[PDB]
Design a protein around this nucleic acid. Structure first.
Ligand SMILES: [Mg+2]
Ligand SMILES: [Mg+2]
Ligand SMILES: [Mg+2]
Ligand SMILES: [Mg+2]
Ligand SMILES: [Mg+2]
Ligand SMILES: [Mg+2]
Ligand SMILES: [Mg+2]
Ligand SMILES: [Mg+2]
Ligand SMILES: [Mg+2]
Ligand SMILES: [Mg+2]
Ligand SMILES: [Mg+2]
Ligand SMILES: [Mg+2]
Ligand SMILES: [Mg+2]
Ligand SMILES: [Mg+2]
Length: 154
RNA sequence: UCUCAUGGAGAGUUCGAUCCUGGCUCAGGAUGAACGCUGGCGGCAUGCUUAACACAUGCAAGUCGGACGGGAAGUGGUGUUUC
């Protein structure tokens, strides 16, 4: 999914040397997502390199039986700050551009998200990833703490 | 994987490009609203925010004759009953 296409420029004695930057995110819509960035002369080739880069950067988002987040979480990258919190089933995914495309492409069905701080599409994508990467799932906190599930549920 | 949550969206704009700080601007709701165009019906509401500025006319607080003396309408007369 192409999130953003921009025309960045290097400048040479001749003139303006134009390239396209592509910010693209890949997912299966099944709980696997990644971001990648690429640069080329034509839209098409940039897009492609973006794809290939993302595919080698990719991670998994912890999901709950209703397709949402285990818990509330913040995230920080650059000036991008990101806030995600789980939602009741049937609220869909409400968020802004980077955060929402990444979330949606992961397959998260119901989530609240807001990016505070900056708006750069890219850093918000990365940030989202750092958010959902640090998501601990209950089985694992029960494994860490060394305490049975039913005890923490309470 | 029980319980809670029924909730927080962004976008353009400084640069040859970038990241940031930072303002302006927009998308939403609400009116005791006004103006423009257009206008079939019904239901329930609303209607001088300004000059506590002036007011023509008409009406918005009376009733009791079982407190009381009278007179005025009739009636034949203080037997009747009204004002
Ligand atoms: Mg900071
Ligand atoms: Mg914001
Ligand atoms: Mg400057
Ligand atoms: Mg310019
Ligand atoms: Mg700011
Ligand atoms: Mg409006
Ligand atoms: Mg008319
Ligand atoms: Mg008044
Ligand atoms: Mg008068
Ligand atoms: Mg009257
Ligand atoms: Mg009488
Ligand atoms: Mg009387
Ligand atoms: Mg009496
Ligand atoms: Mg008598």
């Amino acid at each position: 999914n192409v999130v953003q296409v921009r025309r960045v420029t290097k400048v040479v004695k001749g003139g303006k040397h134009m390239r396209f930057r592509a910010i693209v995110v890949v997912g299966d819509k099944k709980g696997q997502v990644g971001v990648g960035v690429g640069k080329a002369k034509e839209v098409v080739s940039a897009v492609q390199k973006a794809a290939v880069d993302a595919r080698r950067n990719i991670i998994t988002v912890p999901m709950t039986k209703y397709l949402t987040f285990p818990h509330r979480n913040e995230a920080d990258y650059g000036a991008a700050r990101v806030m995600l919190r789980p939602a009741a089933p049937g609220t869909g995914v409400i968020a802004g551009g980077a955060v929402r495309t990444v979330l949606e492409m992961a397959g998260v069905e119901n989530a609240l998200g807001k990016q505070l701080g900056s708006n750069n599409a890219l850093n918000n994508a990365r940030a989202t990833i750092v958010a959902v990467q640090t998501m601990r799932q209950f089985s694992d906190v029960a494994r860490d703490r060394g305490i049975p599930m039913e005890e923490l549920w309470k």
